[PDB]
Amino acid sequence: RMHNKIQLLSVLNTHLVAYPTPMNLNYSWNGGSLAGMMLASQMLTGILLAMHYVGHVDYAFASVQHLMTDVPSGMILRYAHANGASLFFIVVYLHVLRGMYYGSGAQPREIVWISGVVILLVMIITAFIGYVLPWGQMSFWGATVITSLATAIPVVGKHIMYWLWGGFSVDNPTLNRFYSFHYTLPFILAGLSVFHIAALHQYGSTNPLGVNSQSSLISFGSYFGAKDLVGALFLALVFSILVFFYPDLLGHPDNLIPANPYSTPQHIVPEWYFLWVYAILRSIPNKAMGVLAIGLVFASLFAMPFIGLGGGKFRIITEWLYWTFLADVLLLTWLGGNEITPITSFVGQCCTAYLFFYLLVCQPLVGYLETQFAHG
Amino acid sequence: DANPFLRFSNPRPSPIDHTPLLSTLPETRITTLPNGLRVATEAIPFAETTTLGIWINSGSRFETDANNGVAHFLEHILFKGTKNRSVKELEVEVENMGGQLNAYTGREQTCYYAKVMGKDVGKAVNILSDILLNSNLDARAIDKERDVILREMEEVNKQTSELVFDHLHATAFQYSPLGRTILGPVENIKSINRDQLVEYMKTHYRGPRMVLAAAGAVNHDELVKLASDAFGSVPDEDAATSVRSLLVKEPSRFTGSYVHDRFPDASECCMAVAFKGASWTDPDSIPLMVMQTMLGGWDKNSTVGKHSSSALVQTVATEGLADAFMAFNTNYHDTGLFGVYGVTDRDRSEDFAYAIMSNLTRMCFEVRDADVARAKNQLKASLMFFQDSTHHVAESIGRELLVYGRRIPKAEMFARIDAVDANAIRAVADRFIYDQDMAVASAGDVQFVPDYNWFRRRSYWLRY
Amino acid sequence: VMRLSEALYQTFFKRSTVYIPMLLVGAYFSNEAIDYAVDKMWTTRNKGKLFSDIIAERT
């Protein structure tokens, strides 16, 4: 064989052409290839964007405007890079919810789940510090509110805060270092994605039935190339609609105002994909307790392969509870864009309590009850 | 739960008191002749057979470079005719007493013994003294045995385990008398003669180095009279040429080293790893016995290896790392050897080596009490099994008088075993194993055996 | 020939959790000695040319 004589062709053949895949995978197994396509699109658009962006105060806003109106195809590149972050987060969130529904992180795929959670954290940091770069009002004030939350760790507070800022407030050193960190972090994302895919290939994927599928495996490169192409074309349709018809629908109008450190906007909210964490933080009336709850959510995400029992269908109680969890998370996403009100504070506290209750009580105990019902 | 089939027995290891077994064990009587020869008997009350022989505190250690191999050649020559009996006369007289003569020659011990019936004690004494004192040592028989030994040397006719252990003694005891083989080199066999045999027997086979040990059906006074008649003419020993003076003059030395004997088309891969152990007189030799029981041994004809108490046996049997292995505890007059020998192939040699090293170093840190109680019970039961055969009773009498200087009673041995606990095991393992040099020997298909630095690195843990 | 002592081995070398803090205090003192030697040599060689020499001269 021609692929048996060059080691590059052997690896590519083994992992992209002849890789045995279950034949009954539905269209909810296309999240990963879509996420990889969105990562590649973001990298390409950003590398093109960085040839016209200047990472300095008193030039950043004007460089973005010169990019928008004077660079040929520059408006397409900027709007694509802005809405691609939203579509990247949509796809990755649906991927995580698929894994939550089917119990995809269980033995022997715990490394796949853990590397996914690490990828999600790096994605969040990348998107935040990239949102600071246009240097509008929302960029400056979100960077101010989030980075001045290290004053919750006792003693070693404002020292870390002033070392992050490079000064005493968010200013030109903060923007200048945020440009370098934001350029650099997506390559770590690409390497972690390669490691994440390589960890899955050790044992292969789960199937919608939740049973062993070693008897019914087919080649990846013929059957799941066109199936991924169909979903990629749907994603390209949504992407083209967002770029060309509603380019500022998902944004905030305040980020089109140049940043003013002496005047604050009426409502300071982040992008939509950060809103559930913001609601968890804003609901608790203590800064250190809010940061502790935010850390506890991700700790419970890491602990999910070792505490979570229960998968998709034929485990029907946890299957029904998944929809309450999805409603809870979407409610937290809605609450983050509202104002602080006693009823919204009470509802956000109840939603955070139920999120912890589902992640830490329902998944082990109800799953154990389901195993005792089914095979006991 | 079955009422009659589930009482009395349970898998929880608990210490057993072996004190009531001491009430009926027989006593050893020792009589020292004016020659310096000790006569020691142990009468079993209703025995019909008798093992008796002569144990000598000599062997391959006390030779020189010029006559290395004389003591092993002596057991080829000694049974080929004496000055009072011919070959056929000896054969007929041994056949008529219904027993067999036998001989072993170690690095430090030699025995010649007879397993006869109780009516043939005096005849066996007379025959043993006749070969020991009045041998022909004919040059024709020497030439008739030299060529056979040279053929089996040219063919490399040897056991694999003996080959590995001889390499291990040669590399662990470099430039000391214990590094020589019992067989000797080819040149000494090619130039052996009657004079060297006479000089070796005249120098080393003397009164204070010889024990006449008999077990089974034997009277002590009659054996004293027979030994004074027969073995009364052995020379005494000079004070300047005693065993202790020779031990002081040429002491043992341990060197951390590595050897492998590679063959181009072999199938097996035999290997042994040993640490510098304890001498016979070290009080740490009893915990080393308990630790050797804790490591145990296993061969693949057994099918209950996965339910073993020993963790090393469990690991090797479950993962299939070796076809057979055994832990050994060798004791000498002034040094010793402690380690594990095993047989594997070239694809499982590194994992077997890792299992050996990881289980040896683990005894310094974590030792549970159940394993120690189990090993103490197994070692005491093994000591009681040797009391069942009169051959082992006579062998233990001879060995204990040669190397301890006295007959250790069974109550003292049980008390010394029962004083071992988990802290003692951890202390002895810390003394002998942790961050120490080891000796590595292998033979066969040994291209994938790790080198010395790999073995040296795994004698300690960086995580504690 | 020359050989590390057994009693000094059993204290500072057998465990890594005792070896590492000893390593850190030795590292601290080694850095202090190297700093002292370099600074003393530099100040002795360039005496009368530094700014502090002019300032102490003007007192």
Add this chain to the structure above:
Amino acid sequence: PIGVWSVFQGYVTPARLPSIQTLTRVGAWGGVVVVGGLYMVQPWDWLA
């Protein structure tokens, strides 16, 4: 089935748990990270 499934099935006994000596040897790593942090930062005579 690594984690809470091991303790639901009864696979975590008083045996197969680490000993007190094992926990002390692991627990001795607490001083190493403290000394390493104090070596890295050097807040000399900062203890109140």
Add this chain to the structure above:
Amino acid sequence: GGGRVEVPLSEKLPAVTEPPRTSTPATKPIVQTSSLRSGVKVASINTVSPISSLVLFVEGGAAAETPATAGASKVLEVAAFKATANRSTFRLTRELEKIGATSFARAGRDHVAFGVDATRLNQLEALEILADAVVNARYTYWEVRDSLDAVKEQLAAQLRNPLTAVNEVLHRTAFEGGLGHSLVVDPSVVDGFTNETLKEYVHSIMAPSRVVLAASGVDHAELTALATPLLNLHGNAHPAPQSRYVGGAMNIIAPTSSLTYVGLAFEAKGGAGDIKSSAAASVVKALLDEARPTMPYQRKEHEVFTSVNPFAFAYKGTGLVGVVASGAPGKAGKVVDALTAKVQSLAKGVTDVQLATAKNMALGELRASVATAPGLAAAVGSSVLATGKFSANEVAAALSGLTAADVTSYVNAMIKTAPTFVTYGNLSSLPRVDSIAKRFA
């Protein structure tokens, strides 16, 4: 710190002789036998040894096998002492290894034996473990399936020795019936074996009147009182295919046998039941011992032979005394001629010194077989199963009271009976079979 008193020095005041010396029994202990109310016979002999041996003898072996259950005794040797109704395999292994006891399963040509050897302080544990592993054994599917491989290499290794193969073919040729079946079968015989085959074989061989409990160094009243609720057995006696001696001759073709093996055998009349005939057969076996290795490194040279190995088996009702001799491939007819000459010279008379030497050799073998506790327990169990009593004193008296005229008469009556003749090896030189069995006629 631990103990630091060196072993040349006596241990200190914490080393007491608190157990006193128990007085010896007045006489040598005798064998005491009885029968349980279930029908199992129990025989025991007291010893002064600190080791108690318990063995369970069941009639069976290769003589109770069928073509369907072929090679079941060899599988039962490996599959014994595993998971029972009350204990798992892990629990039984740990309970044996806790008290330092050892277990064996050993299959003969007319019996299977199961035994546990332990110290005198753990005799109840050994008895309970042995009874539970024999009576309540489960013989699970997966354990037998995994043991079949090790059975195959053990049989393949045991068939590497040509004397085992010659013994198998000799027993096939000498007998028709139960004793002619093969014990050490080919490895491919047990290729289709399952646990149902072993369970069928065990159900055939097990019956209360075919089971004997033998013990060494155990009080008899205590043993019967504590084994009555444990050995309450039920079952039917499967019919036994009684064997008869007919004689004959056969051959074996071996492609890479560097030597050539010749077997000659006769029938010992009366079997193990007759004390005098078995004693005379043992004396004949010792008289055929040409090269006995009584000394280290002794080189007895024969003109033609390379090895001589006689035997004397004593089954129930019939026996097989004979000799197997090796030799060069080109000298096989000389091996046959020398063997016939040796048996004929034995028939011509034994001369005093040879008779005394063979009697001493037989007495030494008989007394060295029962020297240890497991050997004594095995001897008691086999003798009670074959006859109903243990008669080692009577066997010794028969060996000592044998005259040369009786031995000459015994060999004269032997050579009149038709013999059994078996060859082995890449046979490229052989006298014709009609003249082979003519020299004794």
Add this chain to the structure above:
Amino acid sequence: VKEQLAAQLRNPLTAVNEVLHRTAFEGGLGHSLVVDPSVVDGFTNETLKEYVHSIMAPSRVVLAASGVDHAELTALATPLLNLHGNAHPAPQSRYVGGAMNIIAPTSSLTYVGLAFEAKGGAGDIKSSAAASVVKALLDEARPTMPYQRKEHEVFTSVNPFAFAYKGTGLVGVVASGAPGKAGKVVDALTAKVQ
């Protein structure tokens, strides 16, 4: 070579033929042809060269042909077959007979072979013709039609043979049967020749 030998010894007829040729003869005719595969273990090309050198001599070689002119064949084989060698002595063979048995522990059929010497060998035309006729007579079950259903009471399969060598030969019959029916197979094979 070893796998072909193992394939050939799987047929019990080949093994019975080998044992018959060894048992009936003393000399070169009793040597085994289809040897065990373990025999060819320590075999090299020097062993083959030694065997070829032992068998090669210009008086031991016959060039036969079919469908060619004889004069042209001799004219063209003149400069090719210039063989030089020493005529090694022939280990001549004599019939002795006897009885031997070969054990197969997992064979579902027991084979019985019977044979007699064809005196004269291939040189005697009349004796060879009589041996051929006796081989044809002993062939009880020769299927001459498709799906013939001949049924013997004891003979599972019957194969007669007739061999002709230089100076001697064999003619006889090999009959199989059930393992429990071998004595009746011997009885019928014996009674057939009277």
